[PDB]
Design a protein around this ligand. Structure first.
Ligand SMILES: O=c1cc(CP(=O)(O)O)c2ccccc2[nH]1
Ligand SMILES: [Zn+2]
Ligand SMILES: [Zn+2]
Length: 229
């Protein structure tokens, strides 16, 4: 199932959906896997999250060229940490239009990230304002509230059973909520549940640091986040 391609791993999740995985040594934590998504929408490709680095992200584009061979129309990145935005320059060098939460673009410089070219804004209920996400095809972008970070966003794939929680969601057997350095501990639990409610028919929950899981990832993450209050 898993395909090793250079130093990255690619796994098909649905007929038009693949998970990309890249690795970075985090001293004190080993070599940490980070996952994003690749979606074919007709004659174009859409990317969710970069890899940790520019070189790794260029390798994602190389894999897309070889395995799909269609242009990458856009990428959306899910918050201003290295695992999700560290390869922005590689997307820009390739001429790909890039999108992030407005707050992610505001935070990017101080986080050592390069901002995306376009800013998403969100209605009061969390759904992306559609004018800020033109041509997103099946990607349904939802801001669930502050959690892993204040800017974390999530993405469902219309026409599939897949929703992507990024670093907000941990797996059903996870022991901790991971890096809380930029987290909103008061609101995390409600934000995790809001993600689940936004994508009620998603049976495959994809996330940053574990293999895809059932919706028990959502209930378990929220139940762990209850303890932070
Ligand atoms: O400061 C950090 C930031 C990250 C990236 P994150 O996953 O929070 O987006 C991290 C990831 C794994 C282990 C430790 C870490 N420390
Ligand atoms: Zn993060
Ligand atoms: Zn993470």
């Amino acid at each position: 199932g898993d395909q090793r391609f250079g130093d990255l791993v690619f796994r098909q999740l649905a007929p038009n959906v693949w998970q990309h995985t890249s690795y970075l040594d985090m001293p004190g934590f080993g070599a940490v896997a980070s996952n994003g998504l690749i979606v074919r929408d007709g004659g174009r490709v859409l990317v969710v999250d970069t890899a940790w680095t520019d070189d790794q992200t260029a390798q994602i584009l190389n894999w897309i060229k070889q395995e799909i061979n269609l242009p990458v129309a856009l990428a959306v990145v899910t918050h201003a940490h290295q695992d999700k935005m560290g390869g922005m320059d590689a997307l820009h060098a390739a001429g790909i239009a890039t999108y992030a939460n407005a707050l992610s673009n505001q935070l990017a410089p101080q986080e050592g990230m390069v901002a995306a070219q376009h800013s998403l804004t969100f209605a009061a209920n969390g759904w992306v304002e559609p004018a800020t996400a033109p041509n997103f095809g099946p990607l349904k972008v939802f801001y669930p509230g502050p959690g892993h970070t204040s800017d974390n966003i999530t993405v469902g794939i219309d026409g599939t059973d897949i929703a992507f929680g990024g670093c907000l969601i941990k797996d059903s057997k996870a022991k901790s909520l991971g890096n809380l350095g930029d987290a909103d501990t008061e609101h995390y639990a409600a934000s995790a549940r809001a993600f689940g409610a936004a994508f009620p028919k998603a049976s495959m929950i994809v996330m940053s640091h574990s293999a895809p899981d059932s919706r028990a990832a959502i209930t378990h993450t929220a139940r762990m986040a209850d303890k932070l209050r």
